[PDB]
Amino acid sequence: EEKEILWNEAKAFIAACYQELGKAAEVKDRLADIKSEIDLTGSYVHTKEELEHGAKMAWRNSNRCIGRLFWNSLNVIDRRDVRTKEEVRDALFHHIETATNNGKIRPTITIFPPEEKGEKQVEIWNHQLIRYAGYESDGERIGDPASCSLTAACEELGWRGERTDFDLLPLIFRMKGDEQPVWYELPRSLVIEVPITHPDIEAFSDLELKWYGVPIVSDMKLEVGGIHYNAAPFNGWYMGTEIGARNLADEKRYDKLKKVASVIGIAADYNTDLWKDQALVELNKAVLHSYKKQGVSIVDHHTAASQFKRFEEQAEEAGRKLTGDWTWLIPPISPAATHIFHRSYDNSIVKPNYFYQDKPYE
Amino acid sequence: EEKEILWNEAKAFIAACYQELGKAAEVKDRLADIKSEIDLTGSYVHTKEELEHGAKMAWRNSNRCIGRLFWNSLNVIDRRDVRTKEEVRDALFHHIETATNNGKIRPTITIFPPEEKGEKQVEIWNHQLIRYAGYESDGERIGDPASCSLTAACEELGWRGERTDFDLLPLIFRMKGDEQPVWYELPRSLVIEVPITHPDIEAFSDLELKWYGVPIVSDMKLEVGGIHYNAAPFNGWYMGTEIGARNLADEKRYDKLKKVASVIGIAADYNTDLWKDQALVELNKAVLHSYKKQGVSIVDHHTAASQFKRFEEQAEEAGRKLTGDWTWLIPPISPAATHIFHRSYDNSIVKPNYFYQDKPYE
Numbered sequence: 249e250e251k252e253i254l255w256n257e258a259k260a261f262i263a264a265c266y267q268e269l270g271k272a273a274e275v276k277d278r279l280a281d282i283k284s285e286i287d288l289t290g291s292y293v294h295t296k297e298e299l300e301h302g303a304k305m306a307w308r309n310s311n312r313c314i315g316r317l318f319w320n321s322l323n324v325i326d327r328r329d330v331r332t333k334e335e336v337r338d339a340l341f342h343h344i345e346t347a348t349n350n351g352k353i354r355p356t357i358t359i360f361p362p363e364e365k366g367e368k369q370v371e372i373w374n375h376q377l378i379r380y381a382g383y384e385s386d387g388e389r390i391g392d393p394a395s396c397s398l399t400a401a402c403e404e405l406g407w408r409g410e411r412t413d414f415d416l417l418p419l420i421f422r423m424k425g426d427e428q429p430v431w432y433e434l435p436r437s438l439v440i441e442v443p444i445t446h447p448d449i450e451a452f453s454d455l456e457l458k459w460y461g462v463p464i465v466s467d468m469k470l471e472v473g474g475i476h477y478n479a480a481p482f483n484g485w486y487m488g489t490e491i492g493a494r495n496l497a498d499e500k501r502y503d504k505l506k507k508v509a510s511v512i513g514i515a516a517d518y519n520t521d522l523w524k525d526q527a528l529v530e531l532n533k534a535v536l537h538s539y540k541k542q543g544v545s546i547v548d549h550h551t552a553a554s555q556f557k558r559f560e561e562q563a564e565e566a567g568r569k570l571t572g573d574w575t576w577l578i579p580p581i582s583p584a585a586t587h588i589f590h591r592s593y594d595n596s597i598v599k600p601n602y603f604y605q606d607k608p609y610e
Numbered sequence: 611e612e613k614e615i616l617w618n619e620a621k622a623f624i625a626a627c628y629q630e631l632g633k634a635a636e637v638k639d640r641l642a643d644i645k646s647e648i649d650l651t652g653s654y655v656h657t658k659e660e661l662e663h664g665a666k667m668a669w670r671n672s673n674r675c676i677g678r679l680f681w682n683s684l685n686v687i688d689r690r691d692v693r694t695k696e697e698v699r700d701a702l703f704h705h706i707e708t709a710t711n712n713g714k715i716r717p718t719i720t721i722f723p724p725e726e727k728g729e730k731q732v733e734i735w736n737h738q739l740i741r742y743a744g745y746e747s748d749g750e751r752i753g754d755p756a757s758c759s760l761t762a763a764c765e766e767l768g769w770r771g772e773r774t775d776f777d778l779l780p781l782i783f784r785m786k787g788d789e790q791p792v793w794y795e796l797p798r799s800l801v802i803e804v805p806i807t808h809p810d811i812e813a814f815s816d817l818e819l820k821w822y823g824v825p826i827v828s829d830m831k832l833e834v835g836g837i838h839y840n841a842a843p844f845n846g847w848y849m850g851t852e853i854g855a856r857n858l859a860d861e862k863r864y865d866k867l868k869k870v871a872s873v874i875g876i877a878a879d880y881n882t883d884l885w886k887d888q889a890l891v892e893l894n895k896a897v898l899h900s901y902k903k904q905g906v907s908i909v910d911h912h913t914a915a916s917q918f919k920r921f922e923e924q925a926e927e928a929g930r931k932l933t934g935d936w937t938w939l940i941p942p943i944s945p946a947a948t949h950i951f952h953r954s955y956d957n958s959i960v961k962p963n964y965f966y967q968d969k970p971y972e
């Protein structure tokens with residue numbers, strides 16, 4: 249009954265995958281051995297080629313992603329061989345190192361063993377491999393409020409943060425058979441951070457802002473041909489707005505706009521002065537400038553939008569239907585200055601794809 | 611068969627309308643005389659009260675409108691008595707004068723005779739009562755490109771613009787029975803315009819930018835209880851972004867960002883400089899400052915969003931379901947700085963409401 253669902257997703261995936269790979273004739277045979285493997289074993293195993301391409305397709309089908317133009321150059325690391333938590337840790341450590349690449353970020357995914365009977369083999373608790381802790385007790389707010397629950401969960405497990413605004417959370421994941429996850433402190437040598445400075449305004453450094461170089465989302469499920477890789481951390485490079493317009497700007501995050509307004513020497517008293525808008529722009533100029541000055545890869549929303557237009561064109565030229573989430577594709581600053589704002593997108597879900605899954609904590 | 615459709619929309623409207631007006635007991639009687647009027651005559655006539663409230667409800671149900679908090683103070687002018695084109699013109703002239711109110715803009719609607727058998731009594735060709743002409747021939751682009759087709763249509767009818775970037779289009783409308791519309795030049799004395807200057811940057815005036823004080827949309831159909839008022843021009847005051855972020859900024863409109871960047875003394879060479887974003891902010895600061903300095907009503911997107919939050923609260927407190935179009939409610943600058951961005955809205959269409967209708971020209 250579940251062999252059914254698996255079989256249909258499998259048929260659809262192999263057909264599309266081998267078609268794209270120019271291996272159309274191999275399909276019929278490949279489906280046979282798959283159908284056989286399903287009957288006897290309950291599931292099937294992807295070849296390295298299928299898995300590599302599947303992850304790339306998944307990125308291509310991510311409606312909310314503006315950076316999809318480079319779907320085909322995704323660096324896929326196959327770690328389905330891991331069995332121990334030391335291996336998982338070392339693989340996670342390695343992902344960080346190779347994705348970072350001294351600042352020349354390589355879009356990478358590391359793929360761990362998939363679910364068996366819906367039973368996880370590895371269960372990553374981090375939202376990103378690199379993320380700042382968040383604390384809130386009596387009156388006191390420290391760090392990233394988005395990290396409050398995971399931070400408290402880590403501190404249940406014997407970890408303790410220094411309670412700076414930028415404590416690096418430890419890696420935290422659970423192996424099948426264990427009741428509790430384990431946690432490992434990150435080697436500082438592996439984690440690139442960027443101090444935020446401004447090209448014109450020397451006072452901007454007084455804010456003592458910084459962010460991490462590489463966003464590595466690690467709580468999403470990669471689905472490929474009926475196979476559920478619940479643990480498959482992936483990364484790209486940042487679009488500046490993600491940091492300057494949200495992470496540092498949102499009132500429910502770091503909430504820096506009033507402070508930005510002060511150091512750039514404008515008043516924050518009247519809405520009609522548009523001080524938030526002005527602060528947002530200077531803060532976002534600062535983020536791009538800082539990353540570029542350090543030699544850490546990053547893209548601005550305009551260039552990113554230009555690239556996404558190429559992606560649209562490429563999709564059409566290749567005879568592929570385009571899907572997208574307009575509400576997530578438009579950047580949070582000057583969205584009407586991008587072509588994205590002025591057209592609409594079909595928000596249909598196509599597989600392979602990346603999905604949300606329930607948090608183990610909370 | 612059409613008496614049916616009319617009757618159902620009527621029943622629904624009267625029930626809701628008299629409920630809101632505290633006149634619940636009058637409903638049963640009101641429905642009787644309505645049902646009778648439908649049978650014999652094919653339609654029915656709204657009382658001044660019903661019509662006034664209906665227009666207010668329509669504004670309340672406008673999913674795309676951020677300014678809905680003040681739905682209940684809409685100034686409704688009942689011009690269902692008009693029969694001649696001189697009367698229509700004078701009513702349109704009067705709408706402009708009273709809505710403008712020396713700069714202290716009053717949200718107003720003027721309601722003309724509704725459709726009979728789907729047959730229009732009056733047919734307004736203008737998109738707004740006050741709008742700038744647009745021209746494009748060989749290489750030459752002049753004025754508002756959004757006005758190109760209507761401008762060419764007016765020039766078919768014997769009108770001629772001076773071909774400045776800000777030619778006021780004449781009022782153009784057609785009376786039932788006439789094959790062609792008529793056109794009337796606007797008295798300059800009735801039209802307030804605002805020159806765009808900047809609070810800090812004196813050079814900003816070199817751009818010679820200006821806009822009109824009052825946006826009076828005149829091509830939408832007001833629908834109330836099955837009755838189709840195809841000609842019912844309405845106005846509010848401007849949100850600054852409408853002018854500074856779209857009308858003057860869009861590449862397919864006035865396309866001023868590169869020029870703004872120059873007069874404010876920044877380079878327009880690199881995307882990572884965010885010069886468009888910076889230009890957008892200074893241009894939008896200029897628009898708000900200029901309108902306020904002239905004493906012409908206007909709102910910024912933050913204040914407008916604050917007001918719309920009150921509208922949400924008011925809707926809930928009154929037991930009314932809220933409907934909205936997220937893609938139109940978010941402002942085109944700093945949308946993530948408003949609460950609108952961070953929640954979702956139900957985009958259901960509720961009547962009474964304002965609708966698009968086909969252009970008579972093109």
Ligand code: HEM
Nearest residue numbers: 307310312313314315355482483484485486487490547602
């Ligand atoms: C190469 C540079 C990349 C850039 C600049 C980029 C840009 C973005 C941005 C700005 C978002 C919106 C995130 C937010 O609003 O929080 C996004 C969403 C997303 N991106 Fe990308 N991306 C890149 C690479 C990738 C890669 C390598 C993958 C995976 C293979 C990926 C998959 C996604 C997914 C799944 C989402 C949506 C996540 C969610 O719904 O929460 N992207 N991308």
Ligand code: HEM
Nearest residue numbers: 669672674675676677717844845846847848849852909964
């Ligand atoms: C009082 C001040 C008002 C403000 C600041 C305001 C603000 C806005 C804004 C910014 C838009 C988006 C327009 C665009 O993106 O092109 C909008 C749409 C709209 N507003 Fe309002 N509005 C106001 C009053 C009114 C009034 C009096 C009515 C009618 C009774 C109205 C009905 C609408 C409608 C129907 C739309 C959508 C039109 C369309 O879909 O093209 N608004 N409003």
Ligand SMILES: Nc1ccc2ccc(CCNCCc3cccc(F)c3)cc2n1
Nearest residue numbers: 315375394463465483484485486487490
């Ligand atoms: N630059 C990139 C590259 C790949 C990405 C892949 C996924 C995402 C989504 C990250 N945000 C998800 C929503 C979320 C979840 C948890 C906390 C938050 F603040 C926000 C962002 C990306 N950014």
Ligand SMILES: Nc1ccc2ccc(CCNCCc3cccc(F)c3)cc2n1
Nearest residue numbers: 677737756825827845846847848849852
């Ligand atoms: N400030 C206000 C008040 C009421 C409004 C009522 C309606 C509208 C919609 C105006 N724009 C409609 C879309 C459109 C149509 C035609 C040309 C364009 F450039 C744009 C704007 C309003 N702005």
Ligand SMILES: C[C@H](O)[C@H](O)[C@H]1CNc2nc(N)[nH]c(=O)c2N1
Nearest residue numbers: 589590591592593937938939940
């Ligand atoms: C496709 C998209 O809905 C369309 O381009 C919208 C986007 N949001 C908008 N929002 C406003 N206020 N005005 C507009 O004209 C548009 N255009």
Ligand SMILES: C[C@H](O)[C@H](O)[C@H]1CNc2nc(N)[nH]c(=O)c2N1
Nearest residue numbers: 575576577578951952953954955
């Ligand atoms: C309701 C709405 O879809 C939600 O708040 C979205 C809006 N668009 C977004 N766009 C991006 N890129 N990231 C987000 O977190 C959100 N939040």
Ligand SMILES: [Cl-]
Nearest residue numbers: 463490491495
């Ligand atoms: Cl992030």
Ligand SMILES: [Cl-]
Nearest residue numbers: 825852853857
């Ligand atoms: Cl307008």
